[PDB]
Design a binder for this molecule. Structure first.
Ligand SMILES: CCCCCCCCCCCCCCCCCC(=O)OC[C@H](COP(=O)([O-])OCC(O)COP(=O)([O-])OC[C@@H](COC(=O)CCCCCCCCCCCCCCCCC)OC(=O)CCCCCCCCCCCCCCCCC)OC(=O)CCCCCCCCCCCCCCCCC
Ligand SMILES: CCCCCCCCCCCCCCCCCC(=O)OC[C@H](COP(=O)([O-])OCC(O)COP(=O)([O-])OC[C@@H](COC(=O)CCCCCCCCCCCCCCCCC)OC(=O)CCCCCCCCCCCCCCCCC)OC(=O)CCCCCCCCCCCCCCCCC
Ligand SMILES: CCCCCCCCCCCCCCCCCC(=O)OC[C@H](COP(=O)([O-])OCC(O)COP(=O)([O-])OC[C@@H](COC(=O)CCCCCCCCCCCCCCCCC)OC(=O)CCCCCCCCCCCCCCCCC)OC(=O)CCCCCCCCCCCCCCCCC
Ligand SMILES: CCCCCCCCCCCCCCCCCC(=O)OC[C@H](COP(=O)([O-])OCC(O)COP(=O)([O-])OC[C@@H](COC(=O)CCCCCCCCCCCCCCCCC)OC(=O)CCCCCCCCCCCCCCCCC)OC(=O)CCCCCCCCCCCCCCCCC
Ligand code: HAS
Ligand code: HAS
Ligand SMILES: [Cu+2]
Ligand SMILES: [Cu+2]
Ligand SMILES: [Cu+2]
Lengths: 184, 142, 550, 54, 139, 30, 281, 111
């Protein structure tokens, strides 16, 4: 009959990171209206392929991140450990996928200098990518912490809140992908 | 009974209150003559391993027999060396705690009274109690 | 009978504190570290104001350079707002909020300590820009982006200013996670969301506003560092940009302004029923005034943008006049709770009456500046610099010292002195109305802010000297307050009494001074808005419920 | 007027105004009680002052 | 847990109203289009009070009235154990040093001192997270 | 970018951390 | 009258004189209410704790629901009689007219105010200069407005802008480098100049209806520019409409303000401001 | 660090003259204010070893008592009295545990 403090304090904090992407969307939408006479990518072209497959991986990561956190509530430490290696390797496929999208757009197109679009594309998808790399570090710091105690309910409740951060990263990237690829 | 503002809590901690201008402890000596009396007591009870305690109160009964009841209120009445002063009566009296008898209290306690009676007359009370505890602790050794 | 040591121990032993400052999660100690390590910055920021006031005394560049001046009010506005005024919010929160609810600690104790040290290292990075050859941030504390480029402000030091406000800007976000989830989760059994003091509501509401303001700043400053260290056309003036920053700074800017004001309304609501012997008048209405300020503060960001071309002026006009209504409700609840009670002017009460006198002129000139044609004359003048000291030196000086003098014999167990504390008040309110009252006249006649020299053909000399006469009275006034604390930290009148101010009205006055390491040896039966007035006074419980509601 | 009437009074009035208020407020017979003279029948209380060192 | 979730839903019903009014009025009265930089920060500050606000509804429907909600609850009602609190830790002084030395490196733009600062952040967050889960040394 | 000053930084935080950190893994704490 | 308006200069345009009429709406609103709240805080200094009501705590009243409704609407109607006058007055301002009768570019560059003249058409229809060369503008590959009667104003010349004192005047407000500010304090009005105002969704320009006084007035910069922000003083001159026709005809042949203001027997340097010694050396 | 002040001046942006004067003034000051803070760090570690013998290992768990009274549930590291206070141990130069997981209260994660 108690409201689970450490699961409260994350969602109070995960409301702050949405405001971190309120000052990163506002850089995009004001470099789109007051600067875009034509379409905002003038010398660059965004391929939906290599962008629509890597965003179906984060959708299928938050499925596997939630099917691992169901094994935390039951008590399976090994059910938690299996699906957070499925979630970790698929999140690492996203950073390796999104990192290859940058190489396709730097040595062929625009970078952070040179274009006003390349400075709002590489910061909106840049500080999101640091929230994925910082989210994959929490899948190392949680699975290496299941190896040190008897998998208490405090070991499971910290697996709730690392899952809450990964659903937030997935939801923000839906809000990115459906803005900087489909509302071009 | 209880005073006007105190209240008895769930356990026996009497939680007191004081009106916003007035103080909490009304010791009638100046503040820099209580600080000098602490490190007379605290360093006197540290160098000599006794416990020096100072009593200032009315000994309305017989003087030599009332101060044994004061000695039991010290938290360890074995190493306790109590100095009782009656400012109404000229009734300074040292009460050792029946364990410092082996060490040197018998050559210090008549020296602890005369060095605190010469500082009461033509003087105030806190001059003597400072100049007793730092005198009768040099005579006491662990 | 009842053997006690004569005077309490002045300092501790040798080294009872130095490792207790490194490994601590005690919120009462972290609050005393916020309070001490912000008056370091109230002096570093303050000595810059006395160097920014002697150049303006005699009309000419007397001893400073021109660019040495412009990096003074920059590091005076930054240090006095973001390095003093925002952590003293979470100083009085860590001392008091886990006491005012029946809680042992804050929700996350190692984020309480980590929020202190992100401040103390985030602050000395930004004012560590004085070591640089070009000096620290030459632009304003607002840092408008054509001026904040890599070629208009080329030196580093303006780069440490950006990364001094994201380290400490992360400190307040992690400090506001504690102050919500302590209030939400850790109340006493019997304490409900109401019957909880107004100061805990103010720390609750502004912790919501910290999570709205401070991420939007941190997101804007990382876009300003990509504009400088990398080459990025965010904030570039041909892309929006020079009004992107105007809508990103001030969306942080006025919500951070109201997390400076509202928690020290809570100190002020705490003090008036203690010294006027009767409750907080309109208790629930002050709760619905704090919320409606905290909602309307976020939607008024562009009343700081009236002169810069085109914003939607009638939107941010009317929404800005709507903060005058709840802030005006909080005054009539403050005279109302001061009204019929007998009134003792002790030093916490004395500083809260000086709060009500200075903040009134700070709010009267605020709605003056809210109307845009009245703002079209004075919007970057010294009428503004008068405005945010009558509104700011009231909540952050007259209402922190109201709170320092009110919870000093609860944090240390020593009464801070009152004859020396009345000397410290009357040096301030005599001094403060000498300094900034003439800026209303001098700023409305043509003296714009952020100037170093003002040309003796102008008629500004005989009023800039009146402020400089007054400003050193504010510099002298710190001397009988530092001497008050330094003497009464270790000496000074002991409090063997769990409530030194008589009528405590909160759970912090139902415990010892100082409290134990987990704040409570007992808890009273919490069944009203004020527990320690129904405790300590059982002969009033049949009168709190009856003789209310006129 | 000149650089003497300002700087000789910018630093002068905050010391005169500090000297006026120090004479008013620092001589007001504070709440600490007076010293106990010996010609006084000791109406205060019993007082026990045990040290807490051992 | 009714009037902790109501505290945020009142804030949502204003911000989601102040974001619609501002994006409509700048669509028809500002000198250009919809003023994007301020209407984004109001459409996403009703996302702050909606993630947080509509989460405490699910901790108001799942959870019964705990004694921090009951009107006249005696003090011997929640007399159990609160939970774990770190009694002392020298890790928060090290994470703040580590994040500051990753922010001096982003201020002076030293990429070797960013990366050395980020590596200090992880080992000091690996310290603070793993701290109360180690077990003895197995020799 | 070269010289004996980055040699000293890359010795203490790479070479001697991985020499103490191995010694703390092999040896015990008593 | 003069004391109730806390130091405002008397406006010379009829739009600025409407501000000073509204600024003494401090009397009706601020100093009226600001004496009521002082009249209650200093009224509770006759309510001390005297030694008769010492064992009697007061009535302990906390909720008076008629009072938080009367003393909410009364602060609400005062800001409901405002947001009427401060909407009418800013609608009297922000006003444009397709016969501007002189158009003056101000082009606030880094630290010394390069003015300039564009098209001008009096109500008599007699002068009609209309000079702003687009061929000079095409040498930059922009937003700046270049012209041929520009007033440069170097670091010791302190640029004097000359405009007639019975006509409508338009100020196109551009900036080369940083956001500066354009403030003649006698025009009780101020607008910040931006780098690209039409790219920042700004309004870029304002107009005064007329000038009602002759003479010469100070102009300063307000929003912060950098190092020599205190040195950006310009200085308008409101000459007669007949002396203004003789100003440009001496200037169109090509002279400077030290010579063009001398031919209309007026002091050529700035008389209400002067160059700084701290910048020239 | 004063022999590499041609690199502190260039990369950390301070000065070439100010780095010698923080090396000249600091050569007297900084060995004198590290003597103070380490003589007072060392004794303040000694008092941390005596709050774990006299009271016990500070376990985190609070347990509000039925009359208020937040407590901390120390683990005594020794024998007990018939009253709830522990007997004080003696210091012996050996490192004392401060955390309860290091006393084997964590357990095994399941092999
Ligand atoms: C290349 C770049 C990549 C990024 C760098 C990689 C490393 C970054 C940091 C990694 C964080 C790992 C934490 C997760 C480990 C875990 O499983 O514990 C779960 C932990 C529960 O632990 P528990 O000990 O069992 O709790 C028991 C007690 O209640 C506990 O009570 P307590 O008070 O004793 O303990 C406090 C507890 C409290 O537990 C909570 O639930 C509260 C959570 C509040 C937020 C915590 C994270 C704060 C991150 C700030 C983001 C910065 C924004 C941009 C700058 O919080 C923690 O344990 C760790 C706090 C970490 C602070 C991070 C310091 C700054 C790092 C940012 C560096 C950015 C560099 C930018 C360049 C310049 O819950 C969480 O921490 C929530 C998960 C958050 C997701 C990870 C954060 C992502 C950061 C984004 C990076 C960009
Ligand atoms: C990168 C620069 C440095 C390079 C050096 C690398 C090696 C240094 C450490 C060497 C560790 C010993 C190696 C063997 C131990 C293996 C663990 C084990 O089985 O038993 C646990 C072992 C049991 O010890 P015990 O004798 O049984 O008793 C301990 C008690 O149970 C409980 O004891 P307790 O309560 O007293 O506390 C335990 C713990 C206290 O708890 C902790 O603090 C845990 C620390 C976790 C370490 C996290 C990773 C370390 C490096 C992070 C770098 C991230 C990348 C950043 C790149 C940025 C790019 C933008 O204290 C320690 O264990 C001492 C560790 C000393 C290292 C601290 C580092 C200080 C400076 C960090 C700067 C790193 C250099 C940066 C230069 C620039 C960037 C290149 O505990 C450990 O030693 C844990 C060490 C954690 C290190 C694991 C990773 C190995 C390092 C190689 C990395 C490359 C592989 C990763 C990629 C491959 C992917 C598959
Ligand atoms: C035994 C080993 C003892 C000697 C250690 C020899 C190897 C050391 C490395 C191995 C560490 C591995 C480890 O952690 O094992 C865990 C190990 C496990 O213990 P155990 O296995 O159970 O058994 C060992 C014994 O039983 C338990 O022994 P214990 O625990 O009782 O004693 C621990 C501690 C004894 O405890 C203490 O008393 C330490 C006293 C504090 C010293 C630091 C204070 C200085 C702070 C200055 C602040 C300045 C501003 C102040 C502002 C206020 C005024 C404005 O040991 C020490 O003596 C510390 C050495 C003192 C040197 C500190 C350097 C001061 C220079 C300041 C730099 C600034 C100038 C830059 C320009 O715990 C340790 O013993 C830790 C050893 C101490 C760590 C050494 C850190 C010193 C590093 C110096 C260079 C840093 C400068 C940064 C440069 C950047 C410039 C900005
Ligand atoms: C520059 C950037 C540098 C930042 C890089 C940091 C990244 C993190 C990597 C650390 C990896 C640690 C691996 C070992 C882990 C481990 O074995 O722990 C278990 C081990 C056993 O724990 P246990 O389970 O409790 O067993 C109980 C035992 O009975 C024994 O338990 P005990 O409790 O009785 O003994 C505890 C005590 C043992 O005694 C010591 O070891 C003393 C060591 C002194 C540190 C020397 C740093 C030099 C300071 C320069 C300034 O350990 C400490 O408390 C050390 C605290 C370290 C944080 C303080 C940092 C200095 C503050 C400077 C800020 C200046 C602001 C104003 C001053 C604030 C204070 C008034 O604990 C230790 O004894 C480890 C010793 C910790 C030494 C590591 C110090 C950090 C590395 C150097 C810091 C560089 C400072 C530069 C500052 C720049 C200017 C401000
Ligand atoms: C402690 C921190 C602060 C508080 C609180 C604060 C309150 C207000 N401020 Fe402010 N402020 C502005 C408007 C207001 C308004 C309307 C309020 C309100 O919250 C004031 C509250 C009102 C009251 C407390 C009075 C209520 C009392 C009663 C009894 C109710 C009836 C009385 C009425 C209706 C008044 C009668 C008068 C009439 C004219 C109707 C504006 C402009 O509209 C500017 C920018 C100027 C410019 O152009 O750059 C500004 C600038 C600042 C700056 C500097 C930024 C910079 O340098 O650019 C700071 C630090 C600051 C702090 C603070 N400010 N403010
Ligand atoms: C809560 C926040 C604030 C406080 C407090 C504050 C105090 C003063 N201010 Fe201010 N202020 C100005 C005048 C004063 C004066 C006379 C005081 C007074 O309260 C003075 C307080 C002084 C002290 C309290 C000094 C006491 C210290 C002494 C006597 C000796 C210390 C000794 C040592 C060894 C230091 C100790 C060091 C250790 C490490 C322990 C002026 C004009 O003369 C400007 C505009 C500049 C311009 O032209 O635009 C200004 C500008 C601002 C701005 C706008 C910044 C900007 O435009 O960029 C803000 C936000 C602000 C806030 C605050 N201001 N002020
Ligand atoms: Cu504002
Ligand atoms: Cu300018
Ligand atoms: Cu300027």
């Amino acid at each position: 009959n108690r409201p689970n403090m450490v699961s409260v304090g994350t969602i109070v904090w995960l409301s702050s990171e949405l405001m971190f992407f309120a000052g990163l969307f506002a850089m995009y939408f004001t470099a789109r209206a007051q600067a875009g006479g034509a379409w905002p990518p003038e010398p660059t072209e965004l391929n939906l392929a290599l962008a629509v497959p890597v965003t179906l991986v984060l959708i299928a990561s938050s499925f596997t991140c939630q099917m691992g956190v169901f094994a935390a509530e039951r008590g399976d430490v090994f059910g938690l450990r299996r699906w957070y290696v499925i979630t970790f390797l698929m999140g690492l496929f996203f950073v390796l996928g999104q990192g290859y999208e940058y190489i396709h757009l730097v040595e062929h197109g625009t970078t952070i200098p040179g274009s006003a679009y390349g400075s709002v594309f590489y910061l909106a998808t840049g500080f999101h990518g640091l929230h994925v790399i910082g989210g994959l570090v929490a899948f190392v710091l949680l699975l290496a912490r299941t190896k040190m105690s008897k998998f208490t309910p405090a070991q499971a409740t910290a697996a709730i809140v690392v899952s809450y951060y990964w659903h937030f990263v997935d939801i923000v990237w839906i809000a990115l992908f459906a803005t900087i690829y489909f509302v071009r | 009974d209880l005073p006007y503002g105190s209240a008895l809590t769930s356990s026996g901690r009497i939680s007191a209150v004081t009106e916003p201008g007035e103080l909490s402890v009304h010791y009638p000596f100046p503040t820099m003559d209580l600080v000098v009396l602490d490190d007379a007591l605290k360093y006197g009870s540290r160098a000599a391993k006794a416990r020096f305690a100072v009593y200032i109160g009315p000994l309305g009964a017989d003087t030599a027999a009332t101060a044994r009841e004061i000695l039991a209120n010290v938290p360890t009445p074995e190493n306790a060396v109590l100095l009782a002063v009656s400012p109404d009566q000229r009734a300074i009296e040292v009460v050792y705690g029946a364990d410092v008898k082996g060490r040197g209290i018998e050559s210090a306690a008549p020296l602890g009274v005369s060095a605190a009676a010469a500082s009461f007359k033509e003087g105030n009370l806190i001059d003597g109690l400072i100049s007793a505890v730092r005198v009768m602790s040099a005579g006491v050794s662990p | 009978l009842l053997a006690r040591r004569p005077f309490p121990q002045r300092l501790g032993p040798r080294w009872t504190l130095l490792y207790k400052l490194v490994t601590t999660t005690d919120h009462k100690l972290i609050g005393m570290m916020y309070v001490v390590a912000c008056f370091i910055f109230f002096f570093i920021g303050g000595l810059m104001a006395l160097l920014l006031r002697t150049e303006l005394a005699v009309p000419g560049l007397q001893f400073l350079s021109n660019e040495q001046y412009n990096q003074l009010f920059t590091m005076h506005g930054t240090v006095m707002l973001l390095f003093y005024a925002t952590p003293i919010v979470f100083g009085f929160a860590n001392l008091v909020v886990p006491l005012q609810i029946g809680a042992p600690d804050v929700a996350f104790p190692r984020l309480n300590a980590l929020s202190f040290w992100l401040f103390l290292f985030g602050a000395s990075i930004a004012l560590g820009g004085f070591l640089a050859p070009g000096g620290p941030a030459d632009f304003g504390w607002t840092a408008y982006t054509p001026l904040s480029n890599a070629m208009h402000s080329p030196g580093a030091g303006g780069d440490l200013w950006i990364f001094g406000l994201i380290v400490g800007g992360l400190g307040t976000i992690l400090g506001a996670v504690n102050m919500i989830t302590t209030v939400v989760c850790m109340r006493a059994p019997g304490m409900i969301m109401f019957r909880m003091p107004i100061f805990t509501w103010n720390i609750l509401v502004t912790s919501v506003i910290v999570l709205v303001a401070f991420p939007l700043l941190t997101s804007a400053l990382f876009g300003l560092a990509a504009d400088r260290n990398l080459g990025a056309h965010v904030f570039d003036p041909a892309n929006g940009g020079t009004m992107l920053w105007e809508h990103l700074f001030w969306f942080f800017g006025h919500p951070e302004v109201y997390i400076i004001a509202l928690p020290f309304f809570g100190i002020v609501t705490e003090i008036f029923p203690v010294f006027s012997r009767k409750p907080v008048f309109g208790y629930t209405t002050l709760v619905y005034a704090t919320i409606s300020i905290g909602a309307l503060s976020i939607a008024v960001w562009a009343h700081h943008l009236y002169a810069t071309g085109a914003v939607l002026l009638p939107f941010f006009s009317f929404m800005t006049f709507m903060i005058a209504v709840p802030t005006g409700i909080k005054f009539v609840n403050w005279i109302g709770t001061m009204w019929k009670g007998q009134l003792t002017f002790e030093t916490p009460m004395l500083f809260s009456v000086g709060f009500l006198v200075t903040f009134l002129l700070g709010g009267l000139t605020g709605v003056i500046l809210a109307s845009p044609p009245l703002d079209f004359h004075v919007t970057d003048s010294y009428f503004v610099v008068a405005h945010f000291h009558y509104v700011l030196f009231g909540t952050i000086v007259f209402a922190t010292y109201a709170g320092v003098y009110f919870w000093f014999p609860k944090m240390t167990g020593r009464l801070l002195d009152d004859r020396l504390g009345k000397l410290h008040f009357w040096l301030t309110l005599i001094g403060f109305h000498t300094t900034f009252l003439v800026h209303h006249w001098l700023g409305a006649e043509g003296m714009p802010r952020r100037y170093a020299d003002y040309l003796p053909t102008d008629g500004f000399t005989t009023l800039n000297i009146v402020s400089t006469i007054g400003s050193f009275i504010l510099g002298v006034s710190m001397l009988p307050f530092v001497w008050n604390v330094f003497k009464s930290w270790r000496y000074g009148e002991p409090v063997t009494v769990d409530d030194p101010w008589g009528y405590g009205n909160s759970l912090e006055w139902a415990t010892s001074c100082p409290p134990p390491r987990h704040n409570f040896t007992e808890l009273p039966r919490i069944r009203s808005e004020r527990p320690a007035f129904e405790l300590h006074y059982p002969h009033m419980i049949e009168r709190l419920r009856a003789e209310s509601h006129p | 007027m000149s650089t003497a009437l300002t700087h000789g009074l910018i630093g002068g009035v905050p010391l005169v105004l500090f000297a006026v208020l120090a004479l008013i407020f620092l001589t007001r017979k504070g709440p600490h009680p007076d010293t106990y003279k010996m010609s006084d029948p000791w109406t205060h209380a019993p007082i026990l002052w045990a040290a807490e060192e051992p | 847990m009714h009037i902790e979730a109501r505290l945020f839903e009142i804030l949502t019903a204003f911000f989601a109203l102040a974001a619609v009014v501002y994006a409509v009025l700048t669509a028809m009265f500002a000198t250009g289009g919809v003023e994007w930089a301020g209407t984004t920060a109001l459409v996403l500050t009703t996302g702050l009070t909606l993630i947080t606000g509509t989460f405490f509804r699910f901790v108001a429907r799942r959870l019964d009235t705990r004694p921090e909600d009951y009107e006249d609850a005696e003090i011997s009602d929640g007399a159990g154990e609160l939970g774990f609190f770190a009694p002392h830790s020298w890790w928060p002084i090290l994470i703040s040093l580590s994040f500051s030395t990753a922010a001096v490196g982003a201020a002076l733009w030293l990429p070797w001192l960013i990366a050395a600062g980020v590596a200090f952040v992880i080992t000091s967050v690996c310290g603070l997270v793993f701290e109360y889960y180690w077990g003895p040394e197995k020799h | 970018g070269f010289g004996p000053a980055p040699e000293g930084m890359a010795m203490w935080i790479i070479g001697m951390v991985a020499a103490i950190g191995v010694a703390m893994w092999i040896g015990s704490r008593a | 009258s003069d004391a109730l308006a806390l130091g405002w200069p008397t406006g010379i345009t009829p739009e600025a004189k409407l501000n000073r009429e509204l600024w003494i709406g401090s009397v009706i609103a601020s100093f009226a209410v600001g004496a009521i709240v002082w009249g209650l805080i200093f009224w509770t200094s006759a309510f001390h704790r005297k030694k008769a009501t010492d064992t009697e705590l007061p009535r302990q009243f906390g909720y008076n629901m008629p009072l938080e409704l009367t003393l909410t609407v009364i602060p609400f109607l005062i800001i409901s009689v405002l947001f009427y006058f401060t909407v009418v007055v800013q609608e009297r301002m922000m006003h444009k007219d397709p016969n501007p009768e002189v158009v003056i570019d101000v082009t606030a560059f880094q630290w010394n105010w390069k003015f300039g003249y564009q098209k001008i058409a009096f109500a008599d229809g007699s002068f009609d200069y209309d000079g702003a060369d687009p061929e000079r503008k095409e040498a930059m590959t922009t937003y700046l407005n270049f012209d041929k009667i520009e007033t440069l104003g170097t670091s010791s010349e302190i640029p004097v802008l000359v405009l007639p004192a019975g006509k409508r005047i338009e100020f196109v407000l551009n900036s080369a480098d940083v956001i500066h500010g354009f403030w003649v304090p006698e025009f009780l009005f101020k607008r910040d100049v931006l780098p690209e105002p039409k790219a920042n969704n700004s309004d870029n320009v304002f107009q005064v209806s007329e000038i009602q006084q002759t003479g010469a007035f100070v102009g300063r910069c307000t929003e912060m520019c950098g190092t020599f922000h205190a040195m950006m003083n310009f200085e308008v001159r409101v000459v007669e409409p007949n002396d203004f026709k003789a100003y440009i005809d001496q200037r169109n042949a090509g002279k400077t303000n030290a010579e063009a203001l001398a031919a209309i027997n007026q002091p050529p340097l700035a008389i209400t401001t002067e160059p700084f010694e701290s910048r020239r050396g | 660090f004063a022999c590499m002040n041609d690199i502190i001046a260039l990369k950390f942006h301070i000065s070439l003259n100010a780095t010698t004067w923080i090396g000249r003034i600091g050569m007297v000051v900084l060995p004198a204010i590290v003597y103070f803070v380490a003589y007072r760090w060392a004794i303040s570690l000694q008092r941390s070893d005596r709050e774990v013998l006299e009271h016990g290992v500070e376990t985190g768990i609070i347990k509000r008592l039925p009359h208020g009274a937040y407590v901390e549930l120390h683990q005594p590291l020794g024998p007990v009295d018939e009253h709830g206070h522990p007997i004080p141990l003696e210091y012996a130069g050996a490192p004392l545990p401060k955390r309860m997981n290091k006393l084997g209260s964590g357990g095994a994660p399941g092999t």
